[PDB]
Amino acid sequence: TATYSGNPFVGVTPWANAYYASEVSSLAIPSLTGAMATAAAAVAKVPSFMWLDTLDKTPLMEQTLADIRTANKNGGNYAGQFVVYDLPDRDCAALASNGEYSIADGGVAKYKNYIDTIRQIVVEYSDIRTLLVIEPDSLANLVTNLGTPKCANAQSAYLECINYAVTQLNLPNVAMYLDAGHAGWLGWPANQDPAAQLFANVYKNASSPRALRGLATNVANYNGWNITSPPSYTQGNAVYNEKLYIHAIGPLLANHGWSNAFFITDQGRSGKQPTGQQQWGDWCNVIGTGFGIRPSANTGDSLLDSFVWVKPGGECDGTSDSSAPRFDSHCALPDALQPAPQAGAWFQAYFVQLLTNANPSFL
Numbered sequence: 001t002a003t004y005s006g007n008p009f010v011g012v013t014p015w016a017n018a019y020y021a022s023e024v025s026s027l028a029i030p031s032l033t034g035a036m037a038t039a040a041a042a043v044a045k046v047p048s049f050m051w052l053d054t055l056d057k058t059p060l061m062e063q064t065l066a067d068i069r070t071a072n073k074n075g076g077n078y079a080g081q082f083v084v085y086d087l088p089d090r091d092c093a094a095l096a097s098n099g100e101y102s103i104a105d106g107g108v109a110k111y112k113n114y115i116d117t118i119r120q121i122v123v124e125y126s127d128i129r130t131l132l133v134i135e136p137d138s139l140a141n142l143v144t145n146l147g148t149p150k151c152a153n154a155q156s157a158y159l160e161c162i163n164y165a166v167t168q169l170n171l172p173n174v175a176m177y178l179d180a181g182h183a184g185w186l187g188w189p190a191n192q193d194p195a196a197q198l199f200a201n202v203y204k205n206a207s208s209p210r211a212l213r214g215l216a217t218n219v220a221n222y223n224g225w226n227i228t229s230p231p232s233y234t235q236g237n238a239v240y241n242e243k244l245y246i247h248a249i250g251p252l253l254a255n256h257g258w259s260n261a262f263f264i265t266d267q268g269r270s271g272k273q274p275t276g277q278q279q280w281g282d283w284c285n286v287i288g289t290g291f292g293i294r295p296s297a298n299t300g301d302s303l304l305d306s307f308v309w310v311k312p313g314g315e316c317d318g319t320s321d322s323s324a325p326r327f328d329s330h331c332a333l334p335d336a337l338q339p340a341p342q343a344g345a346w347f348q349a350y351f352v353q354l355l356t357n358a359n360p361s362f363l
């Protein structure tokens with residue numbers, strides 16, 4: 001019902017979900033006052049993506065869509081934004097993943113069951129345009145981390161599952177963007193063609209789904225969209241910002257059979273450049289970051305359908321508690337803000353850091 005032609009971000013308005021607004025209003029604002037408290041309240045109104053990282057989270061997707069349906073009846077012209085993130089043996093390169101499904105334990109079957117719940121929801125809410133980011137931190141590993149056994153052994157499962165998700169969610173009211181890492185990952189010249197080759201193969205293998213509009217980049221990362229000078233940590237890589245990355249891989253996708261692929265790029269934590277990253281590969285609660293460019297389809301660059309906020313600022317990337325199960329040492333590095341809670345949990349000090357270093361400012 002909520003069909004569209006071309007850029008799915010045009011003709012609609014991204015919904016700022018109640019989940020994130022609850023976190024900010026009930027977990028952050030009570031600790032703030034004056035200017036900060038008022039600025040914080042405005043952050044809750046910026047639309048970001050809701051992550052469906054567990055099967056238990058799926059009911060929240062419907063509640064969100066239900067809120068949208070109600071809003072849309074009253075002049076509302078909103079669209080839902082969700083991240084599909086629950087592949088079996090998820091985050092194969094990490095020493096310890098929080099993923100709930102394991103390939104060796106009927107993981108692929110469970111993933112398909114997971115996708116089935118989501119498709120049923122989208123079909124029930126066909127009247128709502130649904131924008132989806134497909135499995136961050138998955139396909140990118142197949143380009144550079146096959147040297148890691150867990151990744152080598154998960155390749156076929158990753159490919160099978162992603163093919164199931166894209167074909168089953170290929171609906172008229174849906175727009176999917178395959179996670180494609182970021183400039184510092186696949187942007188390196190040597191990784192470009194192999195990456196394009198892979199994404200194009202996933203597209204064609206899924207019979208060129210009309211709903212698969214393109215790729216998503218910088219998800220949960222901090223790269224600049226169009227910074228004019230190379231940060232020290234990007235040395236050696238000519239592709240040091242996301243604009244350069246999509247313009248590099250874009251033509252290669254077409255060379256490999258995927259024409260008319262577009263992109264969306266995360267800027268939710270890219271507001272301050274350069275970041276406090278000591279190494280480009282430092283991904284956990286990086287210090288020296290701020291909210292970035294606001295979600296908008298007026299990108300001034302046709303390859304980019306829209307600036308977006310996929311990783312919600314304030315929600316932790318991982319704990320710095322070394323006694324916690326699945327603790328990752330990257331979250332205890334000198335350039336990671338600590339002490340930090342479990343991944344996904346509210347991290348007040350990081351929210352304040354983002355708000356404080358926001359550009360455009362909220363204050």
Ligand SMILES: OC[C@H]1O[C@@H](O[C@@H]2CO[C@@H](OCc3cccc(I)c3)[C@H](O)[C@H]2O)[C@H](O)[C@@H](O)[C@@H]1O
Nearest residue numbers: 051053091094096097137220315316317343344
């Ligand atoms: O905040 C939304 C969503 O965030 C999840 O946490 C994210 C998981 O992916 C991480 O990026 C990939 C990665 C790199 C290295 C090791 C590992 I293990 C993963 C992001 O940094 C992180 O923010 C969180 O799990 C989930 O609950 C939450 O809904």
Ligand SMILES: *[C@@H]1O[C@H](CO)[C@@H](O)[C@H](O)[C@H]1NC(C)=O
Nearest residue numbers: 156159160163201202205206
């Ligand atoms: C193509 O789809 C099948 C479906 O099972 C999957 O197993 C395979 O890995 C996919 N190939 C690629 C390159 O995505």
Ligand SMILES: *[C@@H]1O[C@H](CO)[C@@H](O)[C@H](O)[C@H]1NC(C)=O
Nearest residue numbers: 225226227228293298299300
């Ligand atoms: C980068 O993009 C933002 C938003 O589109 C814009 O305001 C800014 O002028 C751009 N910077 C450059 C150097 O073009």
Ligand SMILES: *[C@H]1O[C@H](CO)[C@@H](O)[C@H](O)[C@@H]1O
Nearest residue numbers: 001002003004005006172
């Ligand atoms: C669904 O219908 C709308 C309005 O007619 C179109 O714009 C879209 O292309 C799809 O066919």
Ligand SMILES: *[C@H]1O[C@H](CO)[C@@H](O)[C@H](O)[C@@H]1O
Nearest residue numbers: 011012013075076077078
């Ligand atoms: C989404 O947001 C509002 C409508 O609710 C408008 O400003 C915009 O054009 C779009 O409809």
Ligand SMILES: *[C@H]1O[C@H](CO)[C@@H](O)[C@H](O)[C@@H]1O
Nearest residue numbers: 018019020022023026027
């Ligand atoms: C609103 O929802 C958020 C997200 O679950 C909670 O953190 C908050 O306590 C309130 O229930």
Ligand SMILES: *[C@H]1O[C@H](CO)[C@@H](O)[C@H](O)[C@@H]1O
Nearest residue numbers: 021022025041042044045
């Ligand atoms: C959470 O609630 C507060 C107060 O109602 C708002 O100011 C904020 O924008 C968010 O909706």
Ligand SMILES: *[C@H]1O[C@H](CO)[C@@H](O)[C@H](O)[C@@H]1O
Nearest residue numbers: 021022023024025026027
């Ligand atoms: C955040 O959550 C609290 C309950 O923990 C609510 O009272 C508040 O309105 C907001 O939803």
Ligand SMILES: *[C@H]1O[C@H](CO)[C@@H](O)[C@H](O)[C@@H]1O
Nearest residue numbers: 027028030031032348349
């Ligand atoms: C908000 O932040 C304050 C400290 O700034 C805490 O004391 C409070 O519990 C909440 O986390």
Ligand SMILES: *[C@H]1O[C@H](CO)[C@@H](O)[C@H](O)[C@@H]1O
Nearest residue numbers: 033034035036037038039
């Ligand atoms: C933040 O600022 C607003 C006015 O802009 C106040 O209404 C609020 O109480 C807080 O001081």
Ligand SMILES: [Co+2]
Nearest residue numbers: 062120121124
């Ligand atoms: Co229902």
